[PDB]
Write an enzyme that holds these catalytic residues in place. Structure first.
Site, PDB file in Angstrom:
ATOM      1  N   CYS B  59     -32.952 -14.286 -15.804  1.00 23.81           N
ATOM      2  CA  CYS B  59     -33.721 -15.477 -15.474  1.00 23.81           C
ATOM      3  C   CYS B  59     -33.499 -15.837 -14.008  1.00 23.81           C
ATOM      4  O   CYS B  59     -32.587 -15.331 -13.350  1.00 23.81           O
ATOM      5  CB  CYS B  59     -33.340 -16.644 -16.389  1.00 23.81           C
ATOM      6  SG  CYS B  59     -31.628 -17.192 -16.224  1.00 23.81           S
ATOM      7  N   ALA B  62     -30.087 -16.993 -13.165  1.00 20.41           N
ATOM      8  CA  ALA B  62     -29.165 -15.893 -12.910  1.00 20.41           C
ATOM      9  C   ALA B  62     -29.330 -15.356 -11.496  1.00 20.41           C
ATOM     10  O   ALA B  62     -28.341 -15.056 -10.817  1.00 20.41           O
ATOM     11  CB  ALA B  62     -29.381 -14.778 -13.933  1.00 20.41           C
ATOM     12  N   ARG B  93     -19.405 -11.845 -12.677  1.00 21.63           N
ATOM     13  CA  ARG B  93     -19.759 -10.987 -11.558  1.00 21.63           C
ATOM     14  C   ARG B  93     -18.599 -10.944 -10.573  1.00 21.63           C
ATOM     15  O   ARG B  93     -18.009 -11.980 -10.249  1.00 21.63           O
ATOM     16  CB  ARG B  93     -21.031 -11.498 -10.881  1.00 21.63           C
ATOM     17  CG  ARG B  93     -21.319 -10.923  -9.517  1.00 21.63           C
ATOM     18  CD  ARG B  93     -22.805 -10.662  -9.389  1.00 21.63           C
ATOM     19  NE  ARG B  93     -23.231 -10.539  -8.002  1.00 21.63           N
ATOM     20  CZ  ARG B  93     -23.434 -11.571  -7.195  1.00 21.63           C
ATOM     21  NH1 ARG B  93     -23.197 -12.811  -7.586  1.00 21.63           N
ATOM     22  NH2 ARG B  93     -23.883 -11.352  -5.964  1.00 21.63           N
ATOM     23  N   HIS B 192     -33.864 -15.279  -6.412  1.00 23.87           N
ATOM     24  CA  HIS B 192     -33.483 -14.956  -5.040  1.00 23.87           C
ATOM     25  C   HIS B 192     -34.333 -15.738  -4.047  1.00 23.87           C
ATOM     26  O   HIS B 192     -33.816 -16.307  -3.080  1.00 23.87           O
ATOM     27  CB  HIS B 192     -33.631 -13.455  -4.791  1.00 23.87           C
ATOM     28  CG  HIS B 192     -32.823 -12.602  -5.717  1.00 23.87           C
ATOM     29  ND1 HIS B 192     -33.122 -11.278  -5.955  1.00 23.87           N
ATOM     30  CD2 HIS B 192     -31.725 -12.879  -6.458  1.00 23.87           C
ATOM     31  CE1 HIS B 192     -32.245 -10.777  -6.806  1.00 23.87           C
ATOM     32  NE2 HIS B 192     -31.386 -11.727  -7.127  1.00 23.87           N
TER      33      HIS B 192
HETATM   34  S1  ICS Z   1     -28.471  -9.028  -5.025  1.00 24.21           S
HETATM   35 FE1  ICS Z   1     -29.351  -8.258  -6.932  1.00 24.21          FE
HETATM   36  S2  ICS Z   1     -28.521  -6.669 -10.727  1.00 24.21           S
HETATM   37 FE2  ICS Z   1     -29.623  -7.153  -4.531  1.00 24.21          FE
HETATM   38  S3  ICS Z   1     -29.501  -9.650  -8.632  1.00 24.21           S
HETATM   39 FE3  ICS Z   1     -28.031  -8.139  -9.137  1.00 24.21          FE
HETATM   40  S4  ICS Z   1     -25.043  -7.339  -5.931  1.00 24.21           S
HETATM   41 FE4  ICS Z   1     -27.851  -5.539  -8.888  1.00 24.21          FE
HETATM   42  S5  ICS Z   1     -29.170  -3.930  -8.031  1.00 24.21           S
HETATM   43 MO1  ICS Z   1     -26.206  -6.847 -10.516  1.00 24.21          MO
HETATM   44  S6  ICS Z   1     -31.016  -6.868  -6.317  1.00 24.21           S
HETATM   45 FE5  ICS Z   1     -27.240  -7.236  -5.664  1.00 24.21          FE
HETATM   46  C1  ICS Z   1     -27.921  -6.960  -7.491  1.00 24.21           C
HETATM   47 FE6  ICS Z   1     -29.114  -5.649  -6.608  1.00 24.21          FE
HETATM   48  S7  ICS Z   1     -25.943  -8.853  -9.309  1.00 24.21           S
HETATM   49 FE7  ICS Z   1     -25.993  -7.108  -7.909  1.00 24.21          FE
HETATM   50  S8  ICS Z   1     -25.638  -5.198  -8.960  1.00 24.21           S
HETATM   51  S9  ICS Z   1     -28.095  -5.463  -4.582  1.00 24.21           S
HETATM   52  S1  CLF Z   2     -33.608 -18.708 -18.993  1.00 22.92           S
HETATM   53 FE1  CLF Z   2     -32.074 -19.121 -17.381  1.00 22.92          FE
HETATM   54  S2  CLF Z   2     -30.159 -18.644 -18.449  1.00 22.92           S
HETATM   55 FE2  CLF Z   2     -31.654 -19.058 -20.079  1.00 22.92          FE
HETATM   56  S3  CLF Z   2     -31.472 -21.429 -20.888  1.00 22.92           S
HETATM   57 FE3  CLF Z   2     -33.151 -20.916 -19.237  1.00 22.92          FE
HETATM   58  S4  CLF Z   2     -32.155 -21.395 -17.230  1.00 22.92           S
HETATM   59 FE4  CLF Z   2     -30.598 -20.840 -18.787  1.00 22.92          FE
HETATM   60 FE5  CLF Z   2     -28.152 -21.386 -21.108  1.00 22.92          FE
HETATM   61  S5  CLF Z   2     -28.670 -23.266 -22.226  1.00 22.92           S
HETATM   62 FE6  CLF Z   2     -28.484 -21.682 -23.894  1.00 22.92          FE
HETATM   63  S6  CLF Z   2     -28.408 -19.758 -22.670  1.00 22.92           S
HETATM   64 FE7  CLF Z   2     -30.624 -20.369 -22.792  1.00 22.92          FE
HETATM   65  S7  CLF Z   2     -30.628 -21.535 -24.740  1.00 22.92           S
HETATM   66 FE8  CLF Z   2     -30.698 -23.378 -23.345  1.00 22.92          FE
END
Ligand code: ICS
Ligand code: CLF
Ligand SMILES: Nc1ncnc2c1ncn2[C@@H]1O[C@H](COP(=O)(O)OP(=O)(O)O)[C@@H](O)[C@H]1O
Ligand SMILES: Nc1ncnc2c1ncn2[C@@H]1O[C@H](COP(=O)(O)OP(=O)(O)O)[C@@H](O)[C@H]1O
Ligand code: SF4
Ligand code: FES
Ligand SMILES: [Mg+2]
Ligand SMILES: [Mg+2]
EC number: 1.18.6.1
Lengths: 283, 477, 121, 274
Positions: B59, B62, B93, B192
């Site tokens: 989402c 995230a 993370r 992002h």
């Molecule tokens: S920010 Fe992105 S999913 Fe670019 S959300 Fe994700 S630390 Fe991946 S492929 Mo986790 S767009 Fe970084 C990424 Fe790549 S968290 Fe890390 S590895 S290079």
């Molecule tokens: S798409 Fe993103 S991570 Fe999902 S809820 Fe929405 S902002 Fe959050 Fe957190 S609280 Fe629980 S897990 Fe969801 S159902 Fe309501």
């Protein structure tokens, strides 16, 4: 003290004469009435003002640059004791054809022309295709009672069905209701009971049947209503009775949509179109 | 090879879907042609996931809180809403950092508004203000507060911008309201973008008057490096050995002071183009700061990026770069000599979020492996145009792959190694195929630079050539 | 978020402050503030609420998702050039034309123009 | 590959005369395209032999969106030479009533249904009001040739005047030109030389004068064209002659819009109205 009324239906039906002769019969009553021609043809005030054509609102806007500078008196002309305005249509092919409607009524509401100094207000609106501005009175609840001028033609049936679909679409957020249908004769044997049948299936009544009369052109040549021309003629009596029952309509019902399959069958039933069958499709 | 076999494979995989799902998914699978420059005629990206297909995308919350805003240590991040959102994103993370937890650093701690039924019914503005006050009283040392909105905040219509402005004026503190509702966007890309926009519209504008900082013709700002397992530290030491000065790091071990000082930097080095291209573009447009992309995955990519980096300065930086290259050559030469024969010829497929599939092909190819399949969860068309060249001919390319799909392609292709996330590690580990967590380096790392390249090679030899892979089938079966 | 509603039908452009990110769209902020934009559907398919969106503060541009329904309705009216479509698909940038019932209010100052006509002249 | 459009008042035999023109064009080894923008999907009834062709927008909305729409699902060739497509229209009062034409034509170019086998493409557009989708084929220069269906009724002349104003407004944008006037005949006196005079003052030519005949209603019951019903019918030869003058028409002029009063003067001098 205002009853808001709309005249709907396909184009070439003859509704514009109907509206003007109806308005003149209300003038004999002494009711103060408003006529708003929301039709790009811009001719719904010829047989009241004895003029070539009323100058519409957008011509004032274009000659004055903007609509705001417009005065009330140039737009509205008082003839036969009834005041008249005309909306018209923009140059064909740019924007919306009903745009001037939005320009007209709004400006009217801005200039106080809609304030309650009149018994009745009418909008002669082309109803061939339900579109923004053409449907604006149905949407913004600017026309409480709607009447359809419908002939025995398939097209008139289809247009009336579309307008009724529009009213039933906006039948929940406003008081826009359909009073009934007015039949203008096309010299068809079974047209009267035909529109009777669609009035019944639509859940409503006939207001009146208008016969095809030659005196209409004789009144048109001087650009006057038939009422003023020959008040002793029978067409004047028909229009007067139509006016009396227009005042006395208390049935303002939410219409019922009718399927096109049923429209086809209704034309076949009144013998206008011959009996179709599935085993006689290939030859 | 066997390109014809590949498209027959994708046809035989797509049959099970209904007509809508089949037609939509057929746009998201392709066979790589390196001669293609515009991927828009071969692959379609950045689209909504088909409902009920076990998608892997996250989402926007995230993508913003768990990716961009989270690594910053001196600021407190508040998950405005229910309890699950922050709880599942708490320290999941490995954005490494230096500091003291709960006193001057708050990365691995969970701040939430603890929404209940009355909070949903009546609103959370007053609760947010009281929470901000209580944050100020309980945590004096912190340099700032960010408020990450969740789905209920956007759905019930609270004004977090107004409360942020009012409380920031009252307490003379920087309050960043960010709207990262999970339903906003189709993936972490919008998270992002939203985090970038909030950074632009609050932190960058917070100080423009200051000039008290002493600049140098060798100021470089790292952009889009999150220090996953220590990656950013290795990149930084490699940079400093070359004679430059790293002012800002975004955002692993990142500080708000570095974020504010970033516009006073001579050159921007963007690591993750996807997550932080918007701020780079805004900086280039406003401050006139030149930015460029560098890759620190594997020796070859590292050397190429280092040379291109030194090319933008005077000859002293180039000489220092050559000195660094000569110094670090024997280490990776020895690593290659030790590990390539054990690692030669193996085929690998990858599936990571963004720019990681394309970044690590060089490291794989240096050790003799070849990539036969790759793809992204949320990469746009530009990343695909960038990555089509780096992959060989007649290889697999996928976007937003589903569990059933990915399982069928791995079953047919039968690779030797697969790099992907936690949500597939154990579904692939029970099929007897070695698997590496490509997101968190499998609790190891770093992988950047030569020091991280050594870790990469060690871990890959360790996982691929393990005895456990030879005992999946019972001797009596 | 400040919104400036302008139209030939309105004698004066109306200024009013709106809450960003409300579940109610710009359609709601239009209804509560006595500004009439033609609305003719509740499923977002008529397109009669087509409007011109201008972000006066160019620096403060917020990314957003152009959903497939809004995309297809903008194709149906025709107010979606190829370049704008590609830009919205890649850089997640808003197009110049929007639908009042499907556009979300973002924290910035905006100017919204309309002609009082349904989408498609 | 020429593109043409029927413009005119409803109920003046636009669909029927158009479809009979298609039937005439099919037989002399020509592959032709037919699409009707009329909100009622009766412009492809006679050729396709279907009770009502499922229009583009209905099955696009049922299938979720026009992207999930297949060309084969709407491109139906009732006869071998000719394919038939219906643009359709929204429910009354739901948005602009012409966006169906927008979507239909855009999808048509998107799937390239205009390729390597087209001699004529012919559209049937409602000419009562030219606005939005109805005015669109004038605007993007899609229809090079426009032909106007008219009768002796005054609203037909006024609609033709509005079409003339529309094409005049967009003359510089492209090669949109008026190829001539075709006039169906009702059982009224002094009709053909009227429309001839309207063409004369319009700067355009009169194509053909199609009369009212009994065979048309029988074809309506049959749901096949007159040429397919009765090739020996004099009306079938009339439609064939009309088609051969459309193919052999060469002059395409910029029309001259005509004011209300001169139209009225012609109408009184012919006595159609008092
Ligand atoms: S920010 Fe992105 S999913 Fe670019 S959300 Fe994700 S630390 Fe991946 S492929 Mo986790 S767009 Fe970084 C990424 Fe790549 S968290 Fe890390 S590895 S290079
Ligand atoms: S798409 Fe993103 S991570 Fe999902 S809820 Fe929405 S902002 Fe959050 Fe957190 S609280 Fe629980 S897990 Fe969801 S159902 Fe309501
Ligand atoms: N009651 C009637 N009897 C005979 N002819 C009529 C009658 N009403 C209208 N007409 C004829 O219909 C023609 C066109 O009608 P008009 O009112 O212009 O249609 P619209 O309402 O679409 O403007 C007129 O020339 C007139 O001669
Ligand atoms: N040559 C002709 N002879 C007799 N009747 C005709 C002729 N051409 C058209 N018509 C009639 O005109 C009517 C209009 O039909 P159609 O073209 O389907 O509607 P529209 O004109 O609105 O497209 C039909 O009912 C048909 O019977
Ligand atoms: S809404 Fe109706 S009148 Fe307006 S442009 Fe569209 S079709 Fe024409
Ligand atoms: S109200 Fe119909 S699309 Fe917005
Ligand atoms: Mg009229
Ligand atoms: Mg027709």
């Amino acid at each position: 003290a205002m009853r808001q009324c709309a005249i709907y239906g396909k184009g070439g039906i003859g509704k514009s004469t109907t509206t003007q002769n109806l308005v003149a019969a209300l003038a004999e009553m002494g009711k103060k009435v408003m006529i708003v021609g929301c039709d790009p043809k811009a001719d719904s005030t010829r047989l009241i003002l004895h003029s070539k054509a009323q100058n519409t609102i957008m011509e004032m806007a274009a000659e004055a640059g903007t609509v705001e500078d417009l005065e009330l008196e140039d737009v509205l002309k008082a003839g036969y004791g009834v005041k008249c305005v005309e909306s018209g249509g923009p140059e064909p092919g740019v924007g919306c054809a009903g745009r001037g409607v939005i320009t007209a009524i709004n400006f009217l509401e801005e200039e106080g022309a809609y304030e309650d100094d009149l018994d009745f207000v009418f909008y002669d609106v082309l109803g061939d295709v339900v579109c923004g501005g053409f449907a604006m009175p149905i949407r913004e609840n600017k026309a409480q009672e709607i009447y359809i001028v419908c002939s025995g033609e398939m097209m008139a049936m289809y247009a009336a069905n579309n307008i009724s679909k529009g009213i039933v679409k906006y039948a929940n957020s406003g008081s826009v209701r359909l009073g009934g249908l007015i039949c203008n004769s096309r010299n068809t044997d079974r047209e009267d009971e035909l529109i009777i049948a669609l009035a019944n299936k639509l859940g409503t009544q006939m207001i009146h049947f208008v016969p095809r009369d030659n005196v209409v052109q004789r009144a048109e040549i001087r650009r006057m209503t038939v009422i003023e021309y020959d008040p002793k003629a029978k067409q004047a009596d028909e229009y007067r009775a139509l006016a009396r029952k227009v005042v006395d309509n208390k049935l303002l019902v939410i219409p019922n949509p009718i399927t096109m399959d049923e429209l086809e069958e209704l034309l076949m039933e009144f013998g206008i179109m011959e009996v179709e069958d599935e085993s006689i499709v290939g030859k | 090879m066997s390109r014809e076999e590949v498209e027959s494979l994708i046809q035989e995989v797509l049959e099970v879907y209904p007509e809508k799902a089949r037609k939509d998914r057929n746009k998201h699978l392709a066979v790589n042609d390196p001669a293609v420059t515009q991927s828009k005629k071969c692959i379609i990206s950045n689209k909504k996931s088909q409902p009920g297909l076990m998608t892997i995308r996250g989402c926007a919350y995230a993508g913003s809180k768990g990716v961009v805003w989270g690594p910053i240590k001196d600021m407190i991040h508040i998950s405005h809403g229910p309890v699950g959102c922050g709880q599942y994103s708490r320290a999941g993370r490995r954005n490494y950092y230096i500091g003291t937890t709960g006193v001057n650093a708050f990365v691995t701690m969970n701040f939430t508004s603890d929404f209940q039924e009355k909070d949903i019914v009546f609103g959370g503005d007053k609760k947010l203000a009281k929470l901000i006050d209580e944050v100020e009283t309980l945590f004096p040392l912190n340099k700032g507060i960010s408020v990450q909105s969740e789905c209920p905040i956007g759905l019930i219509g609270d004004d977090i911008e107004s409360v942020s402005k009012v409380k920031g004026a009252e307490l003379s503190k920087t309050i960043v309201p960010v709207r990262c509702e999970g339903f906003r966007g189709v993936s972490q890309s919008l998270g992002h973008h939203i985090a970038n926009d909030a950074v632009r519209d609050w932190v960058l504008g917070k100080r423009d008057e200051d000039t008290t900082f002493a600049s140098t013709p060798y100021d470089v700002a790292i952009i889009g490096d999150y220090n996953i397992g220590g990656d950013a530290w290795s990149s930084r030491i490699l940079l400093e050995e070359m004679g430059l000065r790293c002012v800002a790091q975004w955002s692993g071990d990142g500080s708000i002071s570095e974020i504010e000082l970033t516009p006073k930097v001579k050159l921007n080095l963007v690591h993750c183009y996807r997550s932080m291209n918007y701020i780079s573009r805004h900086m280039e447009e406003k401050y006139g700061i030149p930015w460029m992309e560098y890759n620190f995955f594997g020796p070859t990519k590292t050397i190429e990026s280092l040379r291109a980096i030194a090319a933008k300065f005077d000859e002293s930086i180039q000489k220092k770069c050559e000195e660094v290259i000569a110094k670090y050559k024997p280490e990776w030469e020895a690593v290659v000599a030790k590990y390539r024969p054990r690692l030669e010829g193996k085929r690998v497929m990858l599936y990571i979020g963004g720019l990681r599939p394309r970044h690590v092909i060089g490291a794989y190819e240096d050790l003799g492996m070849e990539v036969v399949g790759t793809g992204y969860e949320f990469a746009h068309n530009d990343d695909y145009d960038r990555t089509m060249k780096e992959m060989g001919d007649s290889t697999l390319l996928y976007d937003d792959v589903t569990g059933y799909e990915f399982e069928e392609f791995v079953k047919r292709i039968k690779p030797d190694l697969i790099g992907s996330g936690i949500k597939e590690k154990f579904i692939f580990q029970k099929m007897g195929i070695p698997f590496r967590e490509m997101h968190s380096w499998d609790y190891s790392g770093p992988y950047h630079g030569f020091d991280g390249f050594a870790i990469f090679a060690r871990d890959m030899d360790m996982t691929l050539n393990n005895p456990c892979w030879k005992k999946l089938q019972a001797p009596w079966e | 978020a400040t919104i400036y509603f302008s139209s030939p039908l309105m004698p004066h452009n109306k200024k009013v402050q709106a809450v960003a990110g409300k579940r109610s769209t710009l359609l709601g902020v239009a209804q509560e503030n006595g500004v009439k934009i033609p609305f003719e559907c509740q499923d977002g398919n008529c397109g009669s609420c087509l409007v011109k969106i201008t972000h006066l503060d160019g620096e403060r541009i917020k990314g957003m998702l152009l959903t497939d329904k809004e995309r297809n309705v903008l194709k149906s009216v025709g107010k979606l050039p190829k370049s704008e479509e590609e830009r919205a698909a890649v850089r997640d940038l808003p197009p110049t034309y929007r639908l009042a019932c499907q556009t979300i209010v973002t924290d910035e100052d905006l100017l919204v123009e309309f002609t009082g006509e349904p989408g498609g002249a």
